[PDB]
Amino acid sequence: KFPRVKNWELGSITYDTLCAQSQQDGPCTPRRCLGSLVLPRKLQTRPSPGPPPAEQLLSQARDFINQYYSSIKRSGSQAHEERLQEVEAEVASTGTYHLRESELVFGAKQAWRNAPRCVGRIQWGKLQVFDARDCSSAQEMFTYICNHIKYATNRGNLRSAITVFPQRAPGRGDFRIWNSQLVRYAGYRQQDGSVRGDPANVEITELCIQHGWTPGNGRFDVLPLLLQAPDEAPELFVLPPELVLEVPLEHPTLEWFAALGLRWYALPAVSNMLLEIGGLEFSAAPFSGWYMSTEIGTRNLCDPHRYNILEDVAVCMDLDTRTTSSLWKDKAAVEINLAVLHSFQLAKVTIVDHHAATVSFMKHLDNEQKARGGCPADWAWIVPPISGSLTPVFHQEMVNYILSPAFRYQPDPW
Amino acid sequence: GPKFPRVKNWELGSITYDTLCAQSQQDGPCTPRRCLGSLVLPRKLQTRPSPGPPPAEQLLSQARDFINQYYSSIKRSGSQAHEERLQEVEAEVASTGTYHLRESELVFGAKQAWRNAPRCVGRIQWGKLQVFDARDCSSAQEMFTYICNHIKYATNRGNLRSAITVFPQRAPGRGDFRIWNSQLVRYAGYRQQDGSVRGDPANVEITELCIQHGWTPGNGRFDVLPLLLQAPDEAPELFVLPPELVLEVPLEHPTLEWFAALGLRWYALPAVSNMLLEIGGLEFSAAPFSGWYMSTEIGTRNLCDPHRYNILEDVAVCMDLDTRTTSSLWKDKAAVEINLAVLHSFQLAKVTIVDHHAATVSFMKHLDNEQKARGGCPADWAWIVPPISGSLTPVFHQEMVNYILSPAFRYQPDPW
Ligand code: HEM
Ligand code: HEM
Ligand SMILES: [Zn+2]
């Protein structure tokens, strides 16, 4: 019934009783495990042209409201009962309801806390929540986003934040941020099918040009935002350069590294995920924190389908790229990650290396074991892309399941 | 689209569908409610010592399935020979409660068990396996003879060859044939007075057991342990492998001249000996198998794990790195040089070994061969992706479906 979770480095064991609280199904079954799949096959988020079953929504809303009053130690109180009646009354008459700002803040922090793929959850309690539900146009969306960015960047002393735009509504279009992140580098397809810039942003880069953007021709051209108000074509907005903090990359001892002209933005702000609280869905709720160095140094810069700079760096390090056994890729990867850490640290911009991050996550696991009797975690995403076993989480067994409030993937708006 | 798991490779953007999972007849530890795919030992395949004979009804369905697999493999499914073998197996089980495999069936089954192993990245070599039939073995002493021959053949003075020796299957009522050691070659772990361990911390229990059985312990960091071999219904017997038969490689670094002074070393032959081989319901409690090493097993796991030799700090200090701060990536730097030393040394000693890049690339080829040959390949992502440089290898970006197919290698409880 309850999974026996073991840590192989310390020989310690714990039981996850929290997983019993899961109400949403994952992709696995006794016949086969599909935990390595990035996106769901069916756990997607189908349209909302029609109102969701009142009974279903109501049970989800009740659970959430129950969670909320439990957090403020007022479960069973008069306020708790009166709130349930309000939600009850509104759903029965309108088919939906609305959250009080206090509940929204609690819900956003809980969704982060429940995110199985995030290694930085020790920070879950520290999140600035901007209520943008009073937004009625793409222009206003742009203003909220600029304020979010300014606040979150804080001149290099990054502060986690989330801005919540209006919830989805039946038979009405969704408020959406087309870009997958608030700050992305353009990806331009060139003559021979190759790509200049970030190969992962080719499609979005094209949509931007398609919608009137005058494209650049560099390797790190910050993309403009395509923001969409309900049932309207997306509108193009260019982010004020002074709002986009970037860090020039250089190496602590390799004088030539800087000559590579590499750089990366300071703010990691996912903008394409859906936030679900008490059955309510927020199709546009950009969130941000700070980077873990491997995200930039290993994945963004070294992935084969990304900037793929491994060989360039290897050649500059005069390594033997003639064979795999020389481990030239491993050596280059380490120096690139070192350059990222050194540079962000030099530019006084918040960043965390994969060792510090995993160590804090182990602490989080312990805190959660005491607080809730478990912690949903997705091993493949918690263990860093390099030096996996050199970190504590590698040797820690984990249980993965879905708790709500939650952040979920949703279909591309186009 | 197709009603089977959709598997994607995020590097190539290609998609495939796994239809082979449809053939699994054994459940794993996951459910729609939660994924337990990271658990090393989930009480699923766990072949607990089942004293009372197995349900003749359950044994037969498993046996029939295996025979169908075997006849399918030789392209004679539905033939008269197929139906006759099926009748022979059912008859044998009827009058004895069990049955026996023909020589070729055992060979086929051993290879399929390796082929079906979700956690093995070396499966592109699956078709090349020397299967030693030792089902005539009747004593612990004879087990030692078979094991020594296996070691000699497999080691082949450095030009390693994959092999498996199969001892008698579990029999109703009679005790099991067992090799107490988890591997044929292991280094002793000696508990110290201060509580620390000299040697391999992973082998403290087995080391103590060997001592308790008359072994006179050494006091080194790399003392090869003796074998505790157990024949049916007899206490385990102790056997010391002749040094000349255990090929080892002293570790040195290609450029860091001082690394050789560390006195580190590792043995050439990775031979797992505590796993159970299951074929058509029959259980081979003693069926040690071996291939060759993938460098990270030695350089990253065995030498750098916190609970193993834990040499990361020593090497970093030798490289004069800043071990007082994580952002210096001293752990990452030292791990890289330790792995390079392993590859370098094995290559120098002319002992077969494969680096994690070459291995994962060959596994990708294996996945493609298997997609065409069986419509899928059971794979455990966490075990397939190397412990270092994960995303620098192609397997990291490949989604994988994990499920249990039989014949298979399963975990079994310790004999003691
Ligand atoms: C403050 C420091 C933070 C750090 C260092 C951190 C780090 C990470 C990392 C490394 C990943 C995996 C990235 C990948 O492989 O693509 C991740 C995923 C995630 N993080 Fe965090 N995180 C932080 C803040 C946040 C915040 C503030 C939120 C939300 C309020 C959040 C929500 C998530 C979610 C939902 C995922 C999984 C997304 C997916 O499934 O694609 N994180 N985080
Ligand atoms: C040809 C060379 C081979 C290589 C390079 C290779 C490599 C590996 C590696 C790296 C692992 C995971 C090690 C760990 O994390 O503990 C593994 C696991 C495994 N391999 Fe292979 N392997 C090879 C040959 C074999 C052979 C010949 C067999 C059997 C006939 C085999 C059966 C397995 C099994 C069953 C496991 C999983 C055991 C467990 O769950 O602990 N391998 N292999
Ligand atoms: Zn699973």
Side-chain angles (χ1 to χ4, degrees), chain A residues 27-29 32-36 400, chain B residues 29-31 34-38 402:
Chain A
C28 296
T29 66
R32 75 289 180 289
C33 168
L34 297 174
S36 71
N400 189 24
Chain B
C30 300
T31 74
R34 76 288 188 292
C35 177
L36 293 177
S38 70
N402 190 195

Side-chain angles (χ1 to χ4, degrees), chain A residues 197-226:
Chain A
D198 194 341
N201 307 322
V202 175
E203 190 178 13
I204 185 62
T205 294
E206 294 174 4
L207 289 174
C208 289
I209 298 178
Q210 217 138 270
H211 286 274
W213 182 57
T214 298
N217 76 310
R219 287 188 77 180
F220 307 87
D221 294 328
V222 175
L223 289 167
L225 305 177
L226 278 181

Side-chain angles (χ1 to χ4, degrees), chain A residues 1 3-6 8-10 19-20 22-39 41 293 298-299 302-305 310 323-331 333-335 337-338 341 345 353-356 359 377 379-381 383-390 394-402, chain B residues 1-8 10-11 17 21-41 253 300-301 304-307 312 326-333 335-337 339-340 343 347 355-358 381-383 385-392 396-404:
Chain A
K1 314 140 306 306
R4 165 166 153 139
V5 193
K6 170 181 183 173
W8 295 79
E9 173 188 354
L10 306 172
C19 65
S22 177
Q23 299 293 303
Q24 176 74 60
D25 270 351
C28 296
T29 66
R31 165 167 272 76
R32 75 289 180 289
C33 168
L34 297 174
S36 71
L37 282 57
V38 182
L39 305 174
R41 182 68 181 295
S293 57
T298 305
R299 303 304 302 288
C302 302
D303 272 4
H305 54 301
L310 235 32
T323 179
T324 56
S325 58
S326 72
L327 303 187
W328 61 273
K329 291 191 177 178
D330 313 73
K331 284 182 177 178
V334 172
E335 302 305 336
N337 281 77
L338 186 66
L341 286 166
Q345 272 158 24
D353 66 73
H354 51 296
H355 298 292
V359 169
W379 197 92
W381 284 66
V383 177
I386 48 162
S387 311
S389 66
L390 309 186
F394 180 94
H395 309 284
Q396 176 65 62
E397 291 182 344
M398 300 174 198
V399 188
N400 189 24
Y401 48 89
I402 302 166
Chain B
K3 302 197 298 176
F4 301 85
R6 195 192 206 217
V7 192
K8 173 173 181 174
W10 296 79
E11 182 199 325
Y17 287 84
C21 56
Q23 296 309 299
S24 178
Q25 297 196 190
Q26 296 148 169
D27 298 314
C30 300
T31 74
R33 290 259 59 77
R34 76 288 188 292
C35 177
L36 293 177
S38 70
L39 277 58
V40 173
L41 306 172
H253 190 279
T300 305
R301 304 308 306 289
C304 302
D305 270 357
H307 52 295
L312 232 33
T326 54
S327 63
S328 69
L329 305 192
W330 59 270
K331 282 177 174 180
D332 312 72
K333 285 178 162 177
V336 171
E337 298 316 322
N339 279 271
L340 182 62
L343 288 169
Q347 289 173 172
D355 65 76
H356 49 294
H357 300 289
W381 197 91
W383 285 66
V385 176
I388 56 170
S389 304
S391 59
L392 306 187
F396 182 96
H397 310 285
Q398 173 64 57
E399 290 178 342
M400 293 169 206
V401 188
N402 190 195
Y403 46 93
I404 312 167

Side-chain angles (χ1 to χ4, degrees), chain B residues 69-277:
Chain B
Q69 283 191 55
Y70 179 71
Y71 277 81
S72 160
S73 78
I74 57 177
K75 306 297 174 287
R76 297 283 179 274
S77 177
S79 68
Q80 187 171 297
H82 179 188
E83 300 288 358
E84 291 176 359
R85 180 57 176 141
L86 283 171
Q87 302 297 26
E88 172 174 58
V89 173
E90 284 169 42
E92 176 159 41
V93 172
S95 66
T96 73
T98 186
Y99 74 96
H100 297 68
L101 299 171
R102 291 179 177 172
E103 179 189 75
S104 60
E105 306 182 328
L106 176 57
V107 177
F108 166 72
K111 293 179 174 175
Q112 285 299 105
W114 177 10
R115 185 181 189 181
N116 294 333
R119 296 174 172 179
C120 181
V121 70
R123 287 179 281 160
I124 193 181
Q125 294 283 150
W126 81 266
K128 189 173 181 176
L129 178 68
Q130 177 54 48
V131 179
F132 293 113
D133 193 340
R135 295 177 295 168
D136 64 336
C137 191
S138 57
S139 79
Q141 168 64 65
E142 194 178 4
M143 290 179 80
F144 184 58
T145 304
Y146 269 120
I147 289 174
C148 287
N149 282 327
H150 177 135
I151 296 185
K152 284 186 271 199
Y153 179 98
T155 303
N156 187 34
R157 297 162 193 140
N159 180 19
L160 279 51
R161 301 179 291 207
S162 295
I164 184 173
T165 295
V166 184
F167 290 109
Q169 64 198 57
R170 296 173 81 281
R174 190 207 64 200
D176 292 351
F177 272 85
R178 282 299 286 279
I179 294 173
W180 285 33
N181 310 62
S182 62
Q183 286 185 48
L184 303 183
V185 184
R186 298 298 278 160
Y187 292 124
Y190 310 115
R191 189 104 256 169
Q192 302 303 281
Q193 57 238 70
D194 56 47
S196 65
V197 176
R198 182 174 178 63
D200 192 343
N203 308 322
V204 168
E205 175 155 34
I206 183 61
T207 297
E208 302 180 309
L209 287 175
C210 287
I211 293 176
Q212 295 186 176
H213 283 278
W215 182 58
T216 294
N219 72 172
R221 196 170 194 205
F222 301 94
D223 295 332
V224 176
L225 290 169
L227 303 176
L228 273 175
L229 308 185
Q230 182 173 62
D233 306 294
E234 302 198 306
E237 282 175 50
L238 192 65
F239 298 90
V240 174
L241 293 162
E244 59 269 50
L245 296 199
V246 187
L247 183 59
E248 299 183 82
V249 179
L251 302 181
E252 69 175 56
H253 190 279
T255 56
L256 301 172
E257 309 182 17
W258 49 259
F259 199 95
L262 259 24
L264 304 174
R265 60 202 282 124
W266 205 262
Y267 49 89
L269 194 79
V272 181
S273 51
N274 61 176
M275 295 192 77
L276 173 159
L277 169 58

